[PDB]
Each structure stands twice: as structure tokens, then as C-alpha cells.
Structure 1
Amino acid sequence: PGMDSLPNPYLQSVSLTVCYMVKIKANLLSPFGKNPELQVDFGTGTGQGGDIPFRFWYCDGIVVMNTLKDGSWGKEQKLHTEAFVPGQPFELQFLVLENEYQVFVNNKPICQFAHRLPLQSVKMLDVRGDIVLTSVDTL
């Protein structure tokens, strides 16, 4: 049952472009007494409370995306998806384009998020949750 995995939470300094890809490979856990969550932050890395141009949060059939700007969270973009099957390893992709983030799970489009803060201000990628994280790749 043993397998190699990355620290959780996982941090990585980044510089995004208009043609930039993050590929996460992970598996949801079965936490004691709660549903597993998954959270990916494209943050400014300016410390606690610093801006988060794009947070991707998933739990129990629900995706919530949002932006933290000047200590304030904005209007949520919220959808239902069946893409994250518990116990099944998944591949989660973020594509950074000039106009939006595009999100894919297992090679299928899930949702898109129009930029609310400049992609150029993202400095820190942050992956965490009730997951076993096996790889995080960026190009």
C-alpha cells in the first residue's frame, strides 16, 4: 500500500505566462468523518492575507473558484462536477491563457475562470487537501 508522494501542502514559486500549464496528479483520501477537499491557489506569495488571484476549491461534487483581493473575497463562480471520483487517481490541469484559466480533469474541460488580477502577479502555487499528491508539473 506504500507509495511515494509529495509534501502536502505543496508549494512552488512560479512565473505565469499567457501560455502556461500546471499538471497535478493526485488521489482523494477518505478522511475520518468528513468529505475530502482539494484546494489549488495561484497566490501572490506576499504572506498571510496577501492577494490570491485564483483559488480553485473542490469538495463533494462542488467546485468553487474565487479571487482574494485587498483582504476581500469576490463573487464565487460555482459549479457541479462529477469529475473527481473518490479513490480514483485523477489528473488536474490548469491552462493559463491571456484571458482566462482553463481547467481540465482527466483530459476533459471542466470550467474556465476569467482573470480578475494580472496573471503576472501570481508568484506562488499552492496545492493542498485531503489528497495523496504524486506529481506537480509546470511548463
Structure 2
Amino acid sequence: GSSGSSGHQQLNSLPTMEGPPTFNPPVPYFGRLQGGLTARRTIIIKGYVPPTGKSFAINFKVGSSGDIALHINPRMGNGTVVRNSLLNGSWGSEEKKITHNPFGPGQFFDLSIRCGLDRFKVYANGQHLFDFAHRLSAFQRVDTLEIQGDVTLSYVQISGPSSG
């Protein structure tokens, strides 16, 4: 009484994330950034916090090496989104600073992170959520965006230099 099977003749990695945006992406959702953290890059995450989900987490690893430059994790309970960054065999620190926490169990939430040169700019439903100080100088290297935990992703697309 069991169905479904991975079946992989030879372990390999998924192709590029080109083409149209993702629809109803599973979790954890692993979305590699084509290019990397570039001043002209904007990350967008449209999902919804389930009533049975404690909280999720959005970590940004590097496709090249594999280090986390930014690790944001919202907290529906207390109401504080912690920010960290795991470095090569090392770790950064815990950063908490927000004006309004929309993330709520039972209601949708539009999150959009902006990649810049001095720092990042996260927005929530048209509201400056918080900023992320450049911890890893090699931020540009970061070309991987993964999302684990308890979150209902609906639409995910890594806006790039395309629009122009």
C-alpha cells in the first residue's frame, strides 16, 4: 500500500529556473538565483501563512560555495523576525528590528526583498518591513534562495535585469 518513487538513474542537479514564474511551489522551495545578488536584483515571495504553521524561514545560500549571507525567519507568535547569516563553517549573528509584522497565521502575506549595494530592502504589502545589513562582503556570490519551514508559497520569481 504505497505509491510514488524518486527513481534516479544518476544523481544530478535540476536545470536553470528560466521561463515563466513558478506556480504553487512545494516546500521547502529551492529556487537558485540566476546570476547572484546584484544591485539590479529583486527577490519576490508570494505565499500565505497556514493556521497550522508555526513559522517559516528564508535562507540565501551561494550556488558556488554554499554559504548563507542572509537568513530571515518571521515569528508569528512573539512577533519578531530574526536575521542571521551562516558563513563558511562560521555564523553571523541575530538581528531583530521591524516596525510592523504582517505575517499572520490564517492570512496571506506579500513579501519582496530588494538586493542593493549598501544593503537590502524588504517590503510587505507596500510597507518597508526591514533592512538587511551586508554581512558577507561576497554577497554577490549568493545565487541561491531556499525557503523551508511552515509557509504556503503561491508565486515565486527572481526579478532580474530582464525588464529593460
Q: Which runs of 4+ in 1 moved over 4 A?
A: none
User: Which stretch has the larger CA shift, 73-82 or 4-13?
Assistant: 73-82
Q: Which amino acid aligns with 2:127?
A: K
Work out which structure has the larger RCO, using CA pairs closer than 8 Å and 6 or more positions apart in sequence: 1
Give the paired residue count: 131
Q: Which amino acid aligns with 2:67?
A: D
Tell me if structure 2 keeps the 8 A contact 1:30–1:130. Answer: no
Tell me if structure 2 keeps the 8 A contact 1:58–1:64. Answer: yes
Larger Rg: 2
Post-superposition offset of 1:5 = 2.0
Structure 2 equivalent of residue 106 of structure 1: 125
- Percent of aligned pairs sharing the same letter: 33
Q: Distance in 2 between matches of 1:51 and 1:5?
A: 27
Secondary structure, counterpart of 2:140 in structure 1: helix
Structure 2 unpaired stretches of 5+: 1-22, 160-164
Structure 2 equivalent of residue 36 of structure 1: 54
Deviations 1:97-138 (A, max 9, x none): 011111111110011011111221112110122111101111
Structure 1 equivalent of residue 12 of structure 2: none
Q: Distance in 2 between matches of 1:45 and 1:36?
A: 28
Structure 1 equivalent of residue 115 of structure 2: 96
Structure 1 equivalent of residue 7 of structure 2: none
Tell me if structure 1 keeps the 8 A contact 2:64–2:141. Answer: no
Question: What is the aligned counterpart of 2:154 among 126, 130, 134?
Answer: 134
Q: Distance in 2 between matches of 1:82 and 1:12?
A: 24
TM-score, normalised to structure 1's length?
0.85
More strand by share: 1
Structure 1 unpaired stretches of 5+: none
Structure 2 equivalent of residue 75 of structure 1: 93
